[PDB]
Write an enzyme that holds these catalytic residues in place. Structure first.
Site, PDB file in Angstrom:
ATOM      1  N   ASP A   1       0.828  -1.202   0.000  1.00 38.68           N
ATOM      2  CA  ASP A   1       0.000   0.000   0.000  1.00 38.68           C
ATOM      3  C   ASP A   1       0.866   1.257   0.000  1.00 38.68           C
ATOM      4  O   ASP A   1       0.629   2.198   0.753  1.00 38.68           O
ATOM      5  CB  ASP A   1      -0.966   0.006   1.180  1.00 38.68           C
ATOM      6  CG  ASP A   1      -2.079   1.027   1.015  1.00 38.68           C
ATOM      7  OD1 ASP A   1      -2.153   1.675  -0.057  1.00 38.68           O
ATOM      8  OD2 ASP A   1      -2.870   1.202   1.957  1.00 38.68           O
TER       9      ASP A   1
ATOM     10  N   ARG B   1      -0.087   8.980   1.326  1.00 43.18           N
ATOM     11  CA  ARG B   1      -0.802   8.893   2.596  1.00 43.18           C
ATOM     12  C   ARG B   1      -0.130   7.935   3.572  1.00 43.18           C
ATOM     13  O   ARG B   1      -0.437   7.973   4.771  1.00 43.18           O
ATOM     14  CB  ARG B   1      -2.262   8.448   2.360  1.00 43.18           C
ATOM     15  CG  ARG B   1      -2.379   7.059   1.705  1.00 43.18           C
ATOM     16  CD  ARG B   1      -3.807   6.567   1.435  1.00 43.18           C
ATOM     17  NE  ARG B   1      -3.689   5.320   0.684  1.00 43.18           N
ATOM     18  CZ  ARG B   1      -3.637   5.242  -0.643  1.00 43.18           C
ATOM     19  NH1 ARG B   1      -3.775   6.331  -1.409  1.00 43.18           N
ATOM     20  NH2 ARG B   1      -3.444   4.069  -1.207  1.00 43.18           N
ATOM     21  N   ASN B   2       0.746   7.052   3.091  1.00 42.96           N
ATOM     22  CA  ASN B   2       1.469   6.131   3.957  1.00 42.96           C
ATOM     23  C   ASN B   2       2.945   6.502   4.041  1.00 42.96           C
ATOM     24  O   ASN B   2       3.795   5.624   4.196  1.00 42.96           O
ATOM     25  CB  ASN B   2       1.322   4.682   3.490  1.00 42.96           C
ATOM     26  CG  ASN B   2       0.022   4.032   3.959  1.00 42.96           C
ATOM     27  OD1 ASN B   2      -0.500   4.351   5.029  1.00 42.96           O
ATOM     28  ND2 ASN B   2      -0.516   3.127   3.134  1.00 42.96           N
TER      29      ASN B   2
ATOM     30  N   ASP C   1       2.684   2.202   7.368  1.00 39.59           N
ATOM     31  CA  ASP C   1       1.454   1.599   6.854  1.00 39.59           C
ATOM     32  C   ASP C   1       0.407   1.802   7.943  1.00 39.59           C
ATOM     33  O   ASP C   1       0.479   1.155   8.991  1.00 39.59           O
ATOM     34  CB  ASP C   1       1.638   0.119   6.536  1.00 39.59           C
ATOM     35  CG  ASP C   1       0.377  -0.516   5.959  1.00 39.59           C
ATOM     36  OD1 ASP C   1      -0.518   0.213   5.457  1.00 39.59           O
ATOM     37  OD2 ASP C   1       0.298  -1.754   5.998  1.00 39.59           O
TER      38      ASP C   1
END
Ligand SMILES: CCc1cc(NC(=O)Nc2ccc(-c3cnc(Nc4cc(N5C=CN(CC)C=C5)ncn4)s3)cc2)no1
Ligand SMILES: CCc1cc(NC(=O)Nc2ccc(-c3cnc(Nc4cc(N5C=CN(CC)C=C5)ncn4)s3)cc2)no1
Lengths: 301, 297
Positions: A161, A165-166, A179
């Site tokens: 992912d 945003r991570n 994460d």
């Protein structure tokens, strides 16, 4: 030429060491940094975690009461992963854990400026020294994230992912791959799309992951390309003006790809395009990306 | 602190700095006064002969007289004696054969800190990160001035206009000197036969224009004020007049900029002590700021 490319570490079959155990009564919880249905990361103060004398700001990942067995095992495997990775400057580092005396608590470093996506979008709200310095920062962020993913790959971990945003930003403009996982409310995040039985970050995903659920080191590289696009777009969502529907899936399959952001350096867009090859064997490795970016930074000085 | 200097005429020129004049490709003018200018250049084969490197070159205009030509040579000798430090503009080379003096130093790509501070506009995270940058600049300049005084060098014109910013938000102390148009710069006031940065100068220096290590510490305090006030000029609404000189003697001092941490304003206040012997050295300031940055993590 190596076999290390064909093997991954299975966090289930990994082992927890007890060097990390730390008494949970010496944690003073503060504001919630992120939360999903089952999980949360909370800001906390840890007393004597490093030097017996001093308190220390940390981040603690824990589950909500709503969580069932499968999340309890997921938090455990993530604590094992974090323990197995050790220390890298560009990953969130485990500092300790509380698995006795109650629910699992995962203790890591706290990053004081939040996620890169919101950082980028605050910048978005707006020849020139200021633009040059902003470009220098974005080059640095792309370099640091390539180094952190290179480390992950060298430890046979797949992120699955990777996205702005991570990525967390902290003192000195150091970026750390994280994460949020269960500590993100993916149900209300429109970057996560219903696909079959799951809610997936489709716009960051390689075709092998979308259509066959295949995850590899090289599908992380595809996601890294999307991250570069949002990096140099000051955080706009990828494929702008385009819902994830059947037309999206057909378009990725037929070979359409994003144009360059306006202020991406040509060589960073060149990296992006190779990250988006439908054939994983033609994508660069993170080790290769690190080499290319170092040249760009060195020539920039 | 010491109380000794060496004057530049007694320093040597190490001809290992010599660079072929014909390898400079001159670019934009970075700054110019009446007798001198600093221009961006490309130097071919300066650190290794393979490729080129962007540098900055200070030189004199045809207007310069003998005294400005001596001053440039003296500046060259000082930069050679000083050695290398990360928070100083460093000498890279010099042209002294076959033409006027060209002094070749590092080019700082983001210009001076005063202009950088003034070009500014807020969420809490952005505020915090700006504060972290201001603390860094404070620390870096204090380290650079610590280096200058360790070589028994006095700057005499320390100010945000004489701090440069470059890659990685590294600040370098410089001095445009003759490459600033000081007659058209209201921060330099007529005092006797010279135009002097009186708002940055210590009271004890004003009597006979004597600069010391402790008056550099006074100017650093003023520098901290313009730093944490985002580049506003000192003593607002107070021209340099008879009353200004009086008010400083009586003990009037600037209030804290609103965004100065109280610990940084305490440093400013000790920098402005009327007795130079009670002001901190730059070594002590470096130690104080180290603690502040360490706690901020
Ligand atoms: C190898 C890959 C991997 C990851 C993994 N698990 C894994 O990272 N968990 C994990 C652990 C720790 C964290 C965090 C650490 N520090 C954080 N700080 C902030 C600050 C913030 N602010 C917002 C606003 N303001 C002022 C307004 C201040 C702050 N907002 C949100 N967060 S969040 C994230 C995730 N396992 O492997
Ligand atoms: C130890 C104390 C000491 C010093 C000394 N002599 C001494 O420093 N000379 C001296 C040497 C070198 C310099 C300079 C080095 N790089 C510089 N870059 C810039 C860039 C800039 N830009 C503006 C705008 N834009 C947007 C396009 C870009 C750039 N504007 C102004 N300058 S100026 C200054 C002075 N002697 O003792």
């Amino acid at each position: 030429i190596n076999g290390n490319n064909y093997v991954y570490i299975d966090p289930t079959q990994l082992p927890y060491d007890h060097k990390w155990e730390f008494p949970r009564n010496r944690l003073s919880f503060g504001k919630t940094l992120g939360a999903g249905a089952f999980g949360k990361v909370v800001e906390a103060t840890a007393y004597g975690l490093i030097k017996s004398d001093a308190a220390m700001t940390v981040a603690v990942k824990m589950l909500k009461p709503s969580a069932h067995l499968t999340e309890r095992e997921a938090l455990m495997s993530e604590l094992k992963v974090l323990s197995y990775l050790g220390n890298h400057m560009n990953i969130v580092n485990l500092l300790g854990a509380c698995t006795i005396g109650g629910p699992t608590l995962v203790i890591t470093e706290y990053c004081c400026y939040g996620d890169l996506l919101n950082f980028l979008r605050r910048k978005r709200d707006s020849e020139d020294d200021e633009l040059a310095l902003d470009l220098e920062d974005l080059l640095s962020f792309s370099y640091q994230v390539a180094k952190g993913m290179a480390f992950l790959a060298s430890k046979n971990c797949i992120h699955r992912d990777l996205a702005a945003r991570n990525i967390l930003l902290t003192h000195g403009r150091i970026t750390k791959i994280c994460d949020f996982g269960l500590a993100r409310d993916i149900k209300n995040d429109s970057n996560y799309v219903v696909k079959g039985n799951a809610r997936l970050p489709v716009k960051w995903m390689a075709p092998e992951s979308i259509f066959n659920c295949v995850y590899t080191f090289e599908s992380d590289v595809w996601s890294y390309g999307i991250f570069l696009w949002e990096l140099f777009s000051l955080g706009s969502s990828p494929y702008p003006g385009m819902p994830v529907d059947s037309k999206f899936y057909k378009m990725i399959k037929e070979g359409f790809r994003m144009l360059s952001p306006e202020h991406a350096p040509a060589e960073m867009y060149d990296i992006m395009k190779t990250c988006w090859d439908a054939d994983p064997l033609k994508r660069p490795t993170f080790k290769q990306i690190v080499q290319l970016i170092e040249k760009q930074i060195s020539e920039s000085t």
